[PDB]
Amino acid sequence: FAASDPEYVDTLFREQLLEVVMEGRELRKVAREASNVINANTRVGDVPI
Amino acid sequence: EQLLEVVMEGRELRKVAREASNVINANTRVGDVPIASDEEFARPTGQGAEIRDDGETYTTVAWNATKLTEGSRVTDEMRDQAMVDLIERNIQRVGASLENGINRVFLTELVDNAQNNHDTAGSNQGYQALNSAVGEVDKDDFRPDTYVTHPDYRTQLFNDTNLAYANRAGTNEVLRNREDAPIVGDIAGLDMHAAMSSATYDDGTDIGWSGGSETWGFSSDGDKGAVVYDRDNIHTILYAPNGQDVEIKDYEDPIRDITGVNGRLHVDCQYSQGRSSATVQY
Amino acid sequence: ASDEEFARPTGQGAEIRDDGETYTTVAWNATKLTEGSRVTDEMRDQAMVDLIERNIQRVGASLENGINRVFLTELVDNAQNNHDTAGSNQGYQALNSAV
Amino acid sequence: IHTILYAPNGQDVEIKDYEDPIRDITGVNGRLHVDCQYSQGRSSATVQY
Amino acid sequence: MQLRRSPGMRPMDRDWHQERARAREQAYSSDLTSQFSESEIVKYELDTAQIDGSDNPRTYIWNRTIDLFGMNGTDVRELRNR
Amino acid sequence: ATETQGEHTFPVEVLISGEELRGYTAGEALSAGEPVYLSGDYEVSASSADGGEFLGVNLYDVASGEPVALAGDDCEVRVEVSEQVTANDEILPDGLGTFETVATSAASAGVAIVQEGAASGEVCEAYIFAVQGTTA
Amino acid sequence: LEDAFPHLDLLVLDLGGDALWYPYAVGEIQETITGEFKEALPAEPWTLMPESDAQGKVQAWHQRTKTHGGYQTQTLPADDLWHIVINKASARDEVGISEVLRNKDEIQAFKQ
Amino acid sequence: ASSTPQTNVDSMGGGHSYQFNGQDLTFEDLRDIKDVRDSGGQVAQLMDYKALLNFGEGCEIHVEGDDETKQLVDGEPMTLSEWLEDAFPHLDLLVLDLGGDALWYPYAVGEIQETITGEFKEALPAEPWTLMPESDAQGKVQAWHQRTKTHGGYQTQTLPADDLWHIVINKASARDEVGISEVLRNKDEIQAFKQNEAAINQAIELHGFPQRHVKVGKEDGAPVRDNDLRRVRTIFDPRTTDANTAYFTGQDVDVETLEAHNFDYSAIHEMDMRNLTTALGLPLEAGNVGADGLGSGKPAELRFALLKLAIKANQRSFSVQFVERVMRPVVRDYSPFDHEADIRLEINDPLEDIGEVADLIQQVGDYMTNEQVAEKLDLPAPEDDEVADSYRSPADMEKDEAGV
Ligand SMILES: [K+]
Ligand SMILES: [Mg+2]
Ligand SMILES: [Mg+2]
Ligand SMILES: [Mg+2]
Numbered sequence A: 001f002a003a004s005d006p007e008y009v010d011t012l013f014r015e016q017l018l019e020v021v022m023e024g025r026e027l028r029k030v031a032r033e034a035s036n037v038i039n040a041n042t043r044v045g046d047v048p049i
Numbered sequence B: 001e002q003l004l005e006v007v008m009e010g011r012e013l014r015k016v017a018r019e020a021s022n023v024i025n026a027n028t029r030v031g032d033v034p035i036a037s038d039e040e041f042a043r044p045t046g047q048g049a050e051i052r053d054d055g056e057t058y059t060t061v062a063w064n065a066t067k068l069t070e071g072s073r074v075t076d077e078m079r080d081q082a083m084v085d086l087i088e089r090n091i092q093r094v095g096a097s098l099e100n101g102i103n104r105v106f107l108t109e110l111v112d113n114a115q116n117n118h119d120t121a122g123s124n125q126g127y128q129a130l131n132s133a134v135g136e137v138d139k140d141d142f143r144p145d146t147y148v149t150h151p152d153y154r155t156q157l158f159n160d161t162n163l164a165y166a167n168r169a170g171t172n173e174v175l176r177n178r179e180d181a182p183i184v185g186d187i188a189g190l191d192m193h194a195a196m197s198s199a200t201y202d203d204g205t206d207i208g209w210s211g212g213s214e215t216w217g218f219s220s221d222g223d224k225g226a227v228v229y230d231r232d233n234i235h236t237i238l239y240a241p242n243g244q245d246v247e248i249k250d251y252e253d254p255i256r257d258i259t260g261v262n263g264r265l266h267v268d269c270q271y272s273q274g275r276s277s278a279t280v281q282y
Numbered sequence C: 001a002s003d004e005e006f007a008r009p010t011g012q013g014a015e016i017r018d019d020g021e022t023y024t025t026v027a028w029n030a031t032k033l034t035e036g037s038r039v040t041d042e043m044r045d046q047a048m049v050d051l052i053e054r055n056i057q058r059v060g061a062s063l064e065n066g067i068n069r070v071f072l073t074e075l076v077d078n079a080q081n082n083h084d085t086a087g088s089n090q091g092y093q094a095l096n097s098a099v
Numbered sequence D: 001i002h003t004i005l006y007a008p009n010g011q012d013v014e015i016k017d018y019e020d021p022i023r024d025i026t027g028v029n030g031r032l033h034v035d036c037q038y039s040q041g042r043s044s045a046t047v048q049y
Numbered sequence E: 001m002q003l004r005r006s007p008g009m010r011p012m013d014r015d016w017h018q019e020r021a022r023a024r025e026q027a028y029s030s031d032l033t034s035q036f037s038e039s040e041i042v043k044y045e046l047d048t049a050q051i052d053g054s055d056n057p058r059t060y061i062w063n064r065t066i067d068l069f070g071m072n073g074t075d076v077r078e079l080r081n082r
Numbered sequence F: 001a002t003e004t005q006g007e008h009t010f011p012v013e014v015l016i017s018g019e020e021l022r023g024y025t026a027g028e029a030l031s032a033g034e035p036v037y038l039s040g041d042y043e044v045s046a047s048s049a050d051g052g053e054f055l056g057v058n059l060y061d062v063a064s065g066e067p068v069a070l071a072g073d074d075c076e077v078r079v080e081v082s083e084q085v086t087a088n089d090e091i092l093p094d095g096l097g098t099f100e101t102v103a104t105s106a107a108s109a110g111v112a113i114v115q116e117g118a119a120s121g122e123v124c125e126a127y128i129f130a131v132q133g134t135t136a
Numbered sequence G: 001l002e003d004a005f006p007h008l009d010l011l012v013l014d015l016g017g018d019a020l021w022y023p024y025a026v027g028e029i030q031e032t033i034t035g036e037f038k039e040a041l042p043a044e045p046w047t048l049m050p051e052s053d054a055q056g057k058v059q060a061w062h063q064r065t066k067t068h069g070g071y072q073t074q075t076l077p078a079d080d081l082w083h084i085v086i087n088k089a090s091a092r093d094e095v096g097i098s099e100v101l102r103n104k105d106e107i108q109a110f111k112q
Numbered sequence H: 001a002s003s004t005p006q007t008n009v010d011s012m013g014g015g016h017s018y019q020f021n022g023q024d025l026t027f028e029d030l031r032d033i034k035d036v037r038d039s040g041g042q043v044a045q046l047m048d049y050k051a052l053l054n055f056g057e058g059c060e061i062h063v064e065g066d067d068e069t070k071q072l073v074d075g076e077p078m079t080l081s082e083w084l085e086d087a088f089p090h091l092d093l094l095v096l097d098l099g100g101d102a103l104w105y106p107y108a109v110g111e112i113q114e115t116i117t118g119e120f121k122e123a124l125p126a127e128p129w130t131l132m133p134e135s136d137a138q139g140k141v142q143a144w145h146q147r148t149k150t151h152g153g154y155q156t157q158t159l160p161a162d163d164l165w166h167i168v169i170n171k172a173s174a175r176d177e178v179g180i181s182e183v184l185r186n187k188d189e190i191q192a193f194k195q196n197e198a199a200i201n202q203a204i205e206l207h208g209f210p211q212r213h214v215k216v217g218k219e220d221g222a223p224v225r226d227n228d229l230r231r232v233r234t235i236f237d238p239r240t241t242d243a244n245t246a247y248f249t250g251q252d253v254d255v256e257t258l259e260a261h262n263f264d265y266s267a268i269h270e271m272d273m274r275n276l277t278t279a280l281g282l283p284l285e286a287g288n289v290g291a292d293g294l295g296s297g298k299p300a301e302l303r304f305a306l307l308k309l310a311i312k313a314n315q316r317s318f319s320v321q322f323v324e325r326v327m328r329p330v331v332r333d334y335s336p337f338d339h340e341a342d343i344r345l346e347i348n349d350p351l352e353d354i355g356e357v358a359d360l361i362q363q364v365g366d367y368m369t370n371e372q373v374a375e376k377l378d379l380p381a382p383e384d385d386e387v388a389d390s391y392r393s394p395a396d397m398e399k400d401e402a403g404v
């Protein structure tokens, strides 16, 4: 009408984007602490019992 | 001798939204917060096969701040003949009305758009309801840290023997100091409590406001009486043309013996992740 | 003064509307409470204890009891809220519920 | 909740001790004007049996 | 928008206090229509003031037509036993 | 509504003069220059044809539920007409987001007076002098 | 002391002025970052009021000030402010008297 | 204690700071001060006299231990005083301009300016009505916003607080860094003065001079119409009448007079001036008025003591800020001397009597060093250190030496 934001929202300025991206849902990660970890030498193997 | 130079105050509502949410001081009245897609699982594959793409997708939560306003106009004949400073009184009222405005915008978003619910169905409405509501949020893989509470819910909670008995609470602070007790702000892993007023939520009965989807309360079947949520995942976005925050201006009429005070602020409130929040239902 | 209200959502460029502070009053009407006593000069003299100090103390205590009655009668009759205990949970829980 | 005290002279309880020389009597009298009013009766709750 | 005469504003006006106090000191009775102007009754809301003649000092001050003892001007609420 | 200068299109300023700018919630998405009416408590919606539905003109584009500024009685405005109009024509909402003449409509009284004439589908300049509600 | 307080003539006029107008002049000690003395810094007396114990000594200072959209409030311990009183009700009075409020009737009569 | 302030500073209500009171000025408020200054007349002259009393008598630069500063600046030896006197050649004019602006406006404000070579040119004042400060929650200035007329438009810009400097005489509090305009503070008294001047001037025209009233026709007799009065007006016309004109008439023409209706406009002007001068803190005599019983004795001693005390307060307030915000930064940034030196700028007493100083020197000179006498008497100190440091007069030391 008189000069106003919704007339010029993409003409006299750009809408703000927040610079911090918000995270999605993160799952709980425990396996490395919660179990013994073996760094195997081969993709396939056996452990004797 | 001179008459009483005094005014007795009205009801004052509880103002918490600036503390109880992430506050953004926006550079523009409209804007966007960018959101990343959820974590996934790396897929099984054979040797020598191509690794397929499943890259990070993005979206946004738009904010669209609305100008809340409150104003007052008085004649200079009244202003000059007043018992107390009428302009100081109207300044205080205008400021209070805008803080109440923020808290309505915040609480209405918070209650309506929380994606989880714990239905107490009467029964165990005290600590067990807070623990269950944390469970509902935890089951969506978010972790809450704050709760917002109705006066009815507070009353139920401080009758719970787990808080009201010093043996069970581990301190007598809830019995002594009720809401001010440090345990009340340190319960079920939540490190903040935000005590709300009853009138805060948007019933749509107030003039210029159109209501939210829920009933805020904790005294009849189906009322939402508390919200347990992640404070970093609910945003209160404040915009002001002439500063960071609420602006009050002193109007004086060009012709008439009239003065006035007008306050404004632009506010929006939006969840970043509505799954990070659970309502507690009666 | 009237209660705190809520500001209203407003379009940009639109007139901000008036919802200024509005006032009412509570009237007071101070009722005269009185107490008195009389002692003869011969009694004032002969008593082993100061009767005029005892009577000043009685008059003072009686006026204080009067003030204290006016206060309690207002306090109990004109409270706008109420917690009905219905013959149950009458200790701490009633006190918490009244808060 | 306001206890309103009024005294036509001075600030609190008037206590008068006087002697009547005609009857040989000391009178001790006292008075105060008092009202009590809530400013906000909503700010209180009775506990009812 | 509030003028000084507007109903929600009357308790803020110094003159509304002053003229209600002054009305109570002038009256001999609760009969407002007899003692006051229709303007005063409206403007100072005298229906709401506890006007009854009890706050008028001339209710209590003696003023007999013949006084041989200098009794006139004594106020009964200032005696030993009041 | 638009004006052309060389290759460029510019939005028209809906308001020429007046101070009677008032705020409502939008009951639907609205476009600048549309006539609107009350459809709920402080809520405005696009006017239908043939009268009984005009509070003012929407001043800037809004989505549903947003606060809208609106120009009413005593305002002087640039508005798109559905048909040719001339100075001194009375006009009212067309039901199409435009205005039309009282003469063309089924109604007998307008809401604005045309101060500068226009062809169909272009902006006249008009002064808003009345509002229309439910009379039954 | 003359190096600790270089502009004491100005400070004395400011505090001495305030303590005639208001019931008290009041302020802070200030340090440098290194913790050397910087200045005695006055505080705006109309923003501050003392809270006193049962024997009239100041225990805490209560402040309210203009802020975005109204007033902002805090309490400070009396142990790290300082205050000065010229006008007193008695030699026992630690809070003092404003000569403006004391003579407000004469000021109003003059202005009228 | 603490390294930062812990009391709040009552400034930012949410506007520019807060809009109700004299802390906030728009460029329109600033241009109102400018309009009061440039519109001339008695108001402008009185505030120009206030500047002349406070700052017009000129200034002197002192450094404690100045001799110890002796250094080769560019092969040429100087002290810090000598360097400063060369850095600020026209300091009397600068002090009067800045000090004037700092009485009118809330602040004086300006830049530092450099020769192309990077050497100090001057402290350059800026037009104060064009500039307003932006300040933080603890009241300190952080930026300056400037608006200025150009081609009928208004070229506008913002500057950091780092390379401007500013001076405030009229502080609202010891913590106020923005100050008060005395012109805006006393705006009502100024308007009252102007309105009463206009009222008097109009009343003098209407009522100061008698006016002739010719009444025509017999009372209760025949009526006289306008075209009849036109012919009578032709006879008694003051345009063609002269000092000694005489009239001959029938009995039914009366030459009445509106007399000049007396009113004491002199007393009204005196009262207006009494208000305005006192509101501006000037003595009543500055307004060409004066008062009975007040021109002599202890009543005169008091009003002149009060005036000199007010001048000293403003002078010290200006002096300290000019040294701290202008001189020390100029020494630090463009001089080989130590900027932490004990510089003082002092401004002369406008109302000093040299004859009273001379009497004092006759009475008690035997207790003053020749240096202290030279200081009081506003003279260069003696060239020889013992001659300055001694107490018997330099002429007495000369005749004593001539006695050898
Ligand atoms: K049609
Ligand atoms: Mg194998
Ligand atoms: Mg966007
Ligand atoms: Mg492939």
Ligand SMILES: [Mg+2]
Residues within 6 Å of the ligand: B040, B054
């Ligand atoms: Mg995927």
Ligand SMILES: [Mg+2]
Residues within 6 Å of the ligand: B115, B116, B136, B139, B140, B275
């Ligand atoms: Mg879920």
Ligand SMILES: [Mg+2]
Residues within 6 Å of the ligand: B176, B177
């Ligand atoms: Mg406690």
Ligand SMILES: [Mg+2]
Residues within 6 Å of the ligand: B206, B207, C005, C006, C007, C008, C019
């Ligand atoms: Mg409202």
Ligand SMILES: [Mg+2]
Residues within 6 Å of the ligand: C005, C019
């Ligand atoms: Mg209201």
Ligand SMILES: [Mg+2]
Residues within 6 Å of the ligand: F017, F018, F019, F074
């Ligand atoms: Mg107009």
Ligand SMILES: [Mg+2]
Residues within 6 Å of the ligand: F073, F074
């Ligand atoms: Mg109209």
Ligand SMILES: [Mg+2]
Residues within 6 Å of the ligand: H221, H222, H223
């Ligand atoms: Mg005739």
